[PDB]
Write a protein that binds this ligand. Structure first.
Ligand SMILES: Cc1cc2nc3c(=O)[nH]c(=O)nc-3n(C[C@H](O)[C@H](O)[C@H](O)COP(=O)(O)OP(=O)(O)OC[C@H]3O[C@@H](n4cnc5c(N)ncnc54)[C@H](O)[C@@H]3O)c2cc1C
Ligand SMILES: NC(=O)c1ccc[n+]([C@@H]2O[C@H](COP(=O)([O-])OP(=O)(O)OC[C@H]3O[C@@H](n4cnc5c(N)ncnc54)[C@H](OP(=O)(O)O)[C@@H]3O)[C@@H](O)[C@H]2O)c1
Length: 308
């Protein structure tokens, strides 16, 4: 008698792809050092700001999956002569990545530039270090990190994706896996519906990639852009992400009632309310309380949010 079945720890059931998930492999103390293979501006010269897509080599060292983030420890020192604290960035590439070999990682980085009260133009530390990275240079990477935006296991589920600006990053990751890759253990066949809000057309992130997936899966991939400074509804209101969702209020409410519908929200801290505003009205008209309904959705792993 050499064996025993040690009693199992009690565990919550999960609908998301967390099987053998990896978080916090590399710490800022000793980050994985990769290199920059390419770094391109993906917004027009005309856009209000600059967003860049960049790919780093990882030689397979960083075991990330769709929906996770990696931290970056930007080179240099702060005003006190101290090395910089890491900043987190949602991975914009699928687990197999942009080269199909499972040895790289991609980011979608908005260059932060503003002017303080004093009137001085200020440059965010990490965002400007990253957008200025030249192919060949090293970059310090930490993580992976995150379990909140992991994709649902069900390959026939409906995945509604709501993102603003760079919040599109984990959705580019999910979609490459769903429409640009043939996975033996995962072939997607549900409905993938993407809503992206950006300020101008020159600001539309990965439009062309999204347009190829639509051309490749015209049935089950739906794409809706919400260009706030160029589009307007019948009332002349700026087309924000929730203003565009409102044009499909009936259909979305119906899917929200299906049990295999998972909703993901990523991007600006504020997008959150406009959406809830849109939701309460719908549920209301159906004699349902969004407050209560939302709770269930969240506990049911169907209303996933990651905003900054
Ligand atoms: C989980 C997670 C995922 C993220 N994903 C991404 C991503 O994919 N892409 C991306 O670009 N960002 C992402 N971020 C944000 C990112 O981590 C950094 O916060 C961002 O890049 C700015 O950092 P920085 O080092 O450039 O700026 P910092 O040097 O840290 O400066 C930021 C500070 O400047 C001030 N500030 C910022 N904006 C303004 C403004 N408009 N006016 C006045 N003061 C201001 C604030 O005090 C702020 O704390 C994510 C954040 C989190 C938490
Ligand atoms: N995992 C994460 O947590 C994660 C990942 C990626 C990014 N982010 C965060 O999300 C943000 C994306 O930054 P970004 O500069 O790329 O955004 P952005 O370019 O400034 O604008 C995004 C769009 O959202 C609009 N918008 C503003 N307020 C809104 C609201 N209340 N509801 C709906 N839409 C609204 C803007 O319209 P107007 O300009 O006309 O107002 C604009 O069209 C960053 O702050 C970043 O920190 C977080």
């Amino acid at each position: 008698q050499v064996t025993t079945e040690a009693p199992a720890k009690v565990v919550k059931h999960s609908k998301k792809q967390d099987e053998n998930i990896v978080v916090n492999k590399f710490k800022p103390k000793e980050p994985y050092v990769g290199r920059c293979l390419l770094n391109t501006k993906i917004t027009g010269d005309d856009a209000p700001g600059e967003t860049w897509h960049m790919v780093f080599s990882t030689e397979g060292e960083v075991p990330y999956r769709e929906g996770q983030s990696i931290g970056i420890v930007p080179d240099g020192i702060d005003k006190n002569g101290k090395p910089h604290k890491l900043r987190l960035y949602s991975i914009a590439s699928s687990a197999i990545g942009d080269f199909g070999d499972s040895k790289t990682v991609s980011l979608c980085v908005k260059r932060l530039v503003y002017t303080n009260d004093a009137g001085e133009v200020v440059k965010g530390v990490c965002s400007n270090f990253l957008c200025d990275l030249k192919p060949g240079s090293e970059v310090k990477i930490t993580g992976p990190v995150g379990k909140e935006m992991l994709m649902p296991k069900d390959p026939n589920a409906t995945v509604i994706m709501l993102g603003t600006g760079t919040g599109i990053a984990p959705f580019r990751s999910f979609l490459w896996k769903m429409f640009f890759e043939k996975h033996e253990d995962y072939q997607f066949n549900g409905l993938a519906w993407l809503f992206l809000g950006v300020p101008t057309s020159s600001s539309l992130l990965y439009k062309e990639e999204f347009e190829k997936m639509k051309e490749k899966a015209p049935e089950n991939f739906r794409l809706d852009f919400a260009v706030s400074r160029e589009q307007v509804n019948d009332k002349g209101e700026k087309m924000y992400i929730q203003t565009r969702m409102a044009q499909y209020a009936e259909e979305l409410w119906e899917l929200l009632k299906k049990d295999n519908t998972f909703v993901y929200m990523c991007g600006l801290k504020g997008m959150e309310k406009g959406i809830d505003d849109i939701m309460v009205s719908l549920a209301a008209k159906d004699g349902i309380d969004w407050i209560e309904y939302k709770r269930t959705l969240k506990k049911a792993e169907q209303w996933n949010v990651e905003v900054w």
